[PDB]
Subunit: 309 residues, 2 copies
């Protein structure tokens, strides 16, 4: 009949969040219904909360884009799933709730070894990382990568994936308060460096990843994620990346599934592993967001739907 | 020995600033070799050098040209791997339009016996540009689609041939309609330059293409597509697109990537030997006829490369 959900009453600060009961959605054709066990907290959720969003959706709204759980009901015309299957999923909002309906093309079966909390930490960070390194840039042996915010979710995803390719040097920057916790992830770590990087690699780096130029080698790539004659003259590449838009506006679910299958292969070979920081109740969402604002987390924050506060 | 003949650019300006003259034969420094030139490539950049559109411009008088082929006539001190009589093609930082050229050995490549001197002078600029754009800037793979502007030009034809080495690649070309009968078999679909091909492409592929190659001489891109220009950042984020610029000469002579380029040339030569690629030569010109050849490139009248052939009588 009804479910519990986190509701953003309107745009503003933390105190616009509510926990309310609402109608359980039912799966339309080509959707399935997920009994949610965990939800990913992403930086973009803080932006949605303030209304710093392109074409902001109407409030009130249930936030969240990433979740894991158990298939509880099938929509018409769904291939490949049975109720009781364990899955992770993307969803265009509405993830922060006990039940979620989403089109099947955004749903991925998870291995038995993968817990729900890990699974809800898996898709946003690792797909973003994988797509930037191997689909936007073409990371190969011997290259070097500069990763800003090396301690963040995507930063850590990038560092693990780089280690699957031989002889890749990863340069990270981060809050100097974070260095002891993240130092073992990267080859060289800096305290927020151009000179310091140049001292190890005179020409700079092959790939720079920068979240919401002069550091690039020739043929290098700068990628921004969530003067054209200069590019010609300097032989450089600039790119932008928004996983949500790729999914929900541009129709590339099929491609992303390819990426998720490769990510799951790597996970099964024990070459990558999402790092969950802490598990938070639905009542504790304000506190979790605050912790992300205060940059106090080492790993991913995860909402545990069945946790009591 | 005696002085050699060369094309000199007297000063920047129009065609009439180009003349033939005699010059001191250069000798090879350490790590250089000396090449007896048989043919030279004409490139669009040569027209720009002629007007002084190059920031920052070299001093005049000067001998133009960046691409040549010929016979190794002498070795400089540091050099191994070559013998006199070796047939080669080579990049050279100006000074190619002369009977003799000296250039650092990292810019020289041995050519196969099957390859004529005119083909060889047609080979490096166009085919290395094509290769680097498709496989180093973009990462062309099976099933993708490419839009090539000026499909009849040297680079354009090199791009079509290289796409055909990768399975199931759909190549869209634009070109003037009088060229269409001669180049139609080199691409999958060919469109009129001055029509509105955007619609014509979209009618075959609603989403557009994976790679757009646009010369110095956006709305078309699929998600994750790459637009490359060769010789608003929140929009890129929102639309998931890639923009690149490419200048082979800068890569060679300013940025130090001779090693990489040699890798590309070795793979290009492997393809040539397997008969998968072959330079398309538009016309051969005498050294005296350089003005008329430049005019033809300006008038976009060529299909493939224009070559200055040193032993051709005017």
């Amino acid at each position: 009949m009804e479910m519990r959900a986190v509701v953003l009453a309107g745009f503003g600060g933390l105190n616009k969040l509510r926990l309310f009961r609402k109608a359980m959605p039912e799966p339309q054709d080509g959707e399935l219904k997920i009994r949610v066990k965990a939800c990913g907290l992403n930086f973009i959720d803080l932006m949605v909360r303030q209304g710093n969003i392109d074409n902001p959706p109407k409030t009130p709204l249930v936030p969240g884009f990433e979740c894991s759980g158990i298939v509880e009901a099938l929509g018409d015309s769904v291939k490949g799933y049975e109720i009781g299957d364990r899955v992770m999923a993307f969803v265009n909002y509405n993830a922060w709730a006990e039940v979620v309906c989403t089109p099947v093309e955004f749903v991925y079966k998870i291995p038995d070894d993968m817990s729900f909390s890990e699974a809800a930490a898996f898709p946003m960070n690792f797909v973003t990382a994988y797509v930037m390194l191997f689909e936007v840039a073409n990371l190969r042996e011997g290259m070097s990568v500069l990763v800003h915010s090396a301690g963040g979710g995507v930063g850590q995803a990038v560092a693990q994936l780089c280690s699957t390719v031989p002889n890749v040097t990863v340069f990270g920057t981060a809050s100097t308060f974070k260095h002891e916790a993240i130092k073992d992830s990267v080859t060289h770590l800096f305290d927020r460096y151009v000179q310091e990087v140049k001292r190890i690699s005179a020409e700079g780096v092959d790939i720079v990843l920068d979240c919401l130029l002069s550091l690039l080698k020739p043929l290098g790539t700068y990628i921004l994620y969530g003067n054209p004659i200069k590019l010609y003259e300097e032989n450089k590449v600039i790119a932008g990346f928004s996983l949500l838009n790729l999914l929900f506006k541009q129709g590339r679910a099929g491609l992303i599934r390819g990426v998720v299958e490769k990510l799951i292969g790597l996970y099964n070979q024990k070459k990558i592993k999402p790092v969950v920081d802490s598990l938070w109740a639905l009542e504790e969402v304000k506190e979790a967001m605050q912790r992300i604002h205060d940059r106090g987390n080492i790993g991913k924050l995860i909402l545990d739907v069945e946790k009591t506060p």
